[PDB]
Amino acid sequence: RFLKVKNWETEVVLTDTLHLKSTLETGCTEYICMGSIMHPSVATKDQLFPLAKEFIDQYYSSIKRFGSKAHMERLEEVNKEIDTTSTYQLKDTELIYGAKHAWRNASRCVGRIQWSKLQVFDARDCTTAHGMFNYICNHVKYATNKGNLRSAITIFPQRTDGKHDFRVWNSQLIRYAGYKQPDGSTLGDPANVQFTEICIQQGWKPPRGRFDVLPLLLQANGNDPELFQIPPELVLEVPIRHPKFEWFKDLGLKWYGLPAVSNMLLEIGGLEFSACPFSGWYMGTEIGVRDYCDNSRYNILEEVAKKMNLDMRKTSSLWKDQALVEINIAVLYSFQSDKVTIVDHHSATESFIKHMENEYRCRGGCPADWVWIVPPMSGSITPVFHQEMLNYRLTPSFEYQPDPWNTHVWKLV
Amino acid sequence: PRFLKVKNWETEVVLTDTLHLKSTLETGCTEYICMGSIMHPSQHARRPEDVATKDQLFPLAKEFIDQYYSSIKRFGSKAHMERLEEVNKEIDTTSTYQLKDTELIYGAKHAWRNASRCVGRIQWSKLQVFDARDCTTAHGMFNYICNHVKYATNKGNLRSAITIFPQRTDGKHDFRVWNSQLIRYAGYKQPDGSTLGDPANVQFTEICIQQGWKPPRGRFDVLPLLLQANGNDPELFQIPPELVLEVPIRHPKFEWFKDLGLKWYGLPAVSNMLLEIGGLEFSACPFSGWYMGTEIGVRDYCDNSRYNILEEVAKKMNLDMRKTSSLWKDQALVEINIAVLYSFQSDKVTIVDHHSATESFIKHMENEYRCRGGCPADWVWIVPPMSGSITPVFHQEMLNYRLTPSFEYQPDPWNTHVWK
Numbered sequence A: 001r002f003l004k005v006k007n008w009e010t011e012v013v014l015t016d017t018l019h020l021k022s023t024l025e026t027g028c029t030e031y032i033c034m035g036s037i038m039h040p041s042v043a044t045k046d047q048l049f050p051l052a053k054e055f056i057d058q059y060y061s062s063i064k065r066f067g068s069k070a071h072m073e074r075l076e077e078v079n080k081e082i083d084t085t086s087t088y089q090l091k092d093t094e095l096i097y098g099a100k101h102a103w104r105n106a107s108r109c110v111g112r113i114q115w116s117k118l119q120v121f122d123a124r125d126c127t128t129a130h131g132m133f134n135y136i137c138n139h140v141k142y143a144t145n146k147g148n149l150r151s152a153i154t155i156f157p158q159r160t161d162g163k164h165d166f167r168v169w170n171s172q173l174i175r176y177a178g179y180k181q182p183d184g185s186t187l188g189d190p191a192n193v194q195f196t197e198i199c200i201q202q203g204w205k206p207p208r209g210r211f212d213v214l215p216l217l218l219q220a221n222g223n224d225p226e227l228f229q230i231p232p233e234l235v236l237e238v239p240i241r242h243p244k245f246e247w248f249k250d251l252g253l254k255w256y257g258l259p260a261v262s263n264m265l266l267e268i269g270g271l272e273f274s275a276c277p278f279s280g281w282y283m284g285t286e287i288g289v290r291d292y293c294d295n296s297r298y299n300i301l302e303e304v305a306k307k308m309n310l311d312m313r314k315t316s317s318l319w320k321d322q323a324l325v326e327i328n329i330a331v332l333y334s335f336q337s338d339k340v341t342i343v344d345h346h347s348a349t350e351s352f353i354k355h356m357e358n359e360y361r362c363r364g365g366c367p368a369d370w371v372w373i374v375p376p377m378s379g380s381i382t383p384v385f386h387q388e389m390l391n392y393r394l395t396p397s398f399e400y401q402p403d404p405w406n407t408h409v410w411k412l413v
Numbered sequence B: 001p002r003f004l005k006v007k008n009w010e011t012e013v014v015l016t017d018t019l020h021l022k023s024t025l026e027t028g029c030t031e032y033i034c035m036g037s038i039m040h041p042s043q044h045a046r047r048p049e050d051v052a053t054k055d056q057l058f059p060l061a062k063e064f065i066d067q068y069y070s071s072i073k074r075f076g077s078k079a080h081m082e083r084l085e086e087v088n089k090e091i092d093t094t095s096t097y098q099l100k101d102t103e104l105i106y107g108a109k110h111a112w113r114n115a116s117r118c119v120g121r122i123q124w125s126k127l128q129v130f131d132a133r134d135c136t137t138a139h140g141m142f143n144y145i146c147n148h149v150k151y152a153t154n155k156g157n158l159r160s161a162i163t164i165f166p167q168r169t170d171g172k173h174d175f176r177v178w179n180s181q182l183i184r185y186a187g188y189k190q191p192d193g194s195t196l197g198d199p200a201n202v203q204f205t206e207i208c209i210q211q212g213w214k215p216p217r218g219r220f221d222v223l224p225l226l227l228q229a230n231g232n233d234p235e236l237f238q239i240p241p242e243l244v245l246e247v248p249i250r251h252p253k254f255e256w257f258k259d260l261g262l263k264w265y266g267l268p269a270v271s272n273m274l275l276e277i278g279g280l281e282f283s284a285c286p287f288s289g290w291y292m293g294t295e296i297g298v299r300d301y302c303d304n305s306r307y308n309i310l311e312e313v314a315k316k317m318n319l320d321m322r323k324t325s326s327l328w329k330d331q332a333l334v335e336i337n338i339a340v341l342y343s344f345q346s347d348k349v350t351i352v353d354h355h356s357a358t359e360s361f362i363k364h365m366e367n368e369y370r371c372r373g374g375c376p377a378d379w380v381w382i383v384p385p386m387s388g389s390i391t392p393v394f395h396q397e398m399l400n401y402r403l404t405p406s407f408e409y410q411p412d413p414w415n416t417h418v419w420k
């Protein structure tokens, strides 16, 4: 069986075989598509070995050693660990291969042309939150590279019984605080108000500014999470100015240079790495500075539209569209000026099409979530919009996982 | 499973869907693969390639008539049981059956209601149905279509309408509108490789020229109608210009913009789809409404032979076109869309921006979950092609499923037509 995807702009047709090797649900059924559902839906010995066999088989396939004496001994060595300890341990080579291929397999990620150049930090000897703070600080310093950003992941110890989990409670490593005000207004980032309250409650003393870098909330071995302040010299930041509007800088805006997802789960061969913060660089449109509040009533969108003298009465003036472009121009120009890595949504989508076609040639396909590959603006004038895409779940993978404050059973009285 | 929740991640509104339990035909997805971004993911028809036996057509007929009499709170009534027997005898003796006028109107409106890709469905029950099943020639089709265009255009106060030509019998006597839309601009392939006019319509324009049409080879040449009746060779017809309402595009602030000499037509009227009711296949069913401003593809239009209207507008805007990160396509795209809305409104021609249209669709979705138990919707097509994340539908989850009656896609007639 062979499935085809067409590009309705170029007429190119790619033939997908890789989809034959997927295994877990998309969420869709034969009669319902869930393509626009965000989340649609501890291992025993008998579940774990088929999964381990799967991953090991594919790793040894990837290094042209399938069936080799080294392959069969590894499989036997894994079987013994699982039989003895109800789990097993990845070699360093397998950990690297697996983390790299989880990114390769991430169908919602447009930046995968870079997947093979991922720096993997093995943190499976970490035992304490302080060690997590040490590992994470070294990640940040390395990834940031004085603005010449570099992809990296840091992998903390895997799940055991589910009661000794390692978790980064932050959703990203660097985010700005959000405070809801008595009058209902919001200071800082509205997207982070709930996590900020958790931190304040844990004892964090909030500066109550507008761009307060949140503290790290780190959990080792299933213990209560602990607060740590990232050293400010390690948080690279870009003041936002517009190349044409000299007034734009006066909005007072900045963003952090390094995007670093820390709340997802890395699954390799049936092992779950509940803390695996990974970082790349931004596509321009991801930066949500739009949702800040300049005054007590207006968005940065509304404020930018105001200062542009836009007719903000009727929607059909497209003032919201107009201001959105300008904010994105400013974000891109600002990063580029400060020589901090960033990619515009045109450059990223074009490279993704090149990557997708090359993945079909060497790999037999490339799972892709069109709902997520298409940028949040100017969708149809980017090349992915007319690109058909097949979505399926390959493993290794990154997976969503519950927020730790909904499941953590608190230790100390 | 039992009931499927959908969530709006801006408002946290959760709707609970049970209507999907009445889904008939495959989406193309499996547990393991999703085809949500394939244009035509499935070929799961409800009946074989042409004239079907009774056991193939009647179950389809029964289900629709059942649903129609349920719709009006009969079911099991004298009229309902009598109608089933009428459809039965009719298939026994002609291998098909004929919808009542009530049945035809209900099915048309519910094929619109069920169009999971259509953001305009808030208005679904306000649809004017023109029964043209007595038509027998291309001239008759040309007359029917002409009256559709006049009624729907309504001097700019556009009204939704559908004209329904005779159903397919054996597949050899099809009625077909060979145009994809009733009004479209021609696309000429220039001997140097660039295109003049609308590049989306180059093939069809060449098909018309090949059929005897004389291209004016001007700028905005309305394509003739290529009308096929009863399976005969199709015929060319020129829509009277006074019936083709056009809006000159100017810009509210850029005065140079009108000097681009651009214009678009007011009436979008899809004419190449197939309407399917109770097993019957109406292969000629042109329908029309009014444009969402983003749909007007004037940006790809080539007046010159060097530059899109997009890159042309960017030149007049003095935009840094050196690299992409200036976002010059983004900026020009907004201005062009500002210009289009402004002109349609200035000339009193009905149009809707993508914010109002998407806001309306969320209202529609709520109603549909409140009364019907759900609403099928294709996120890949409901989200507008610009500024997606600032419209309300971006953050709305949707369930896609195929309900009948529906509008289906169908091969371009020239692939499958043998000439008399």
Ligand code: HEM
Binding pocket: A103, A106, A108, A109, A110, A111, A112, A114, A118, A151, A152, A153, A264, A278, A279, A280, A281, A282, A283, A286, A343, A348, A372, A398
């Ligand atoms: C190197 C530059 C990268 C770029 C430009 C990039 C770009 C993007 C974008 C734009 C999204 C969509 C998220 C949104 O729209 O809010 C995304 C998703 C994602 N990316 Fe990448 N990414 C990069 C690197 C990485 C790396 C290094 C990894 C893993 C090691 C990764 C894994 C993912 C995952 C798992 C998602 C899905 C997130 C979710 O489902 O919530 N990405 N990426």
Ligand code: HEM
Binding pocket: B108, B111, B112, B115, B117, B118, B119, B120, B121, B123, B127, B160, B161, B162, B287, B288, B289, B290, B291, B292, B295, B352, B357, B381, B407
């Ligand atoms: C009255 C105003 C209407 C508006 C604003 C509207 C809006 C839209 C839009 C924006 C699309 C996306 C297509 C694209 O962007 O290329 C669409 C698709 C569609 N519309 Fe509506 N529409 C309207 C009326 C109607 C009517 C009256 C019918 C039929 C009775 C209809 C049936 C459809 C169908 C079947 C599709 C799917 C097209 C396909 O699969 O290619 N629409 N509509």
Ligand SMILES: Nc1cccc(CCCCNCc2cccc(OCc3ccc4ccc(N)nc4c3)c2)n1
Binding pocket: A038, A259, A260, A261, A278, A279, A280, A281, A282, A283, A286, A371, A372, A373, B009, B394, B395, B396
């Ligand atoms: N540079 C880089 C580098 C590495 C990783 C990334 C990706 C960061 C992803 C952060 N986690 C994204 C997210 C999670 C949950 C909700 C979100 O917003 C709500 C929402 C709702 C509906 C959507 C429909 C389509 C679509 N495409 N997005 C939607 C988002 C975002 N980036």
Ligand SMILES: Nc1cccc(CCCCNCc2cccc(OCc3ccc4ccc(N)nc4c3)c2)n1
Binding pocket: A008, A385, A386, A387, B039, B120, B268, B269, B270, B287, B288, B289, B290, B291, B292, B295, B380, B381, B382
């Ligand atoms: N006012 C109104 C009123 C009634 C009806 C309409 C709709 C007019 C539709 C005309 N038929 C346009 C069309 C059909 C098929 C393909 C097209 O382009 C290719 C393409 C490829 C991938 C896509 C992915 C997502 C997406 N949303 N579109 C895609 C389009 C255009 N309008």
Ligand SMILES: [Zn+2]
Binding pocket: A028, A032, A033, A034, A035, B029, B033, B034, B035, B036
């Ligand atoms: Zn699907």
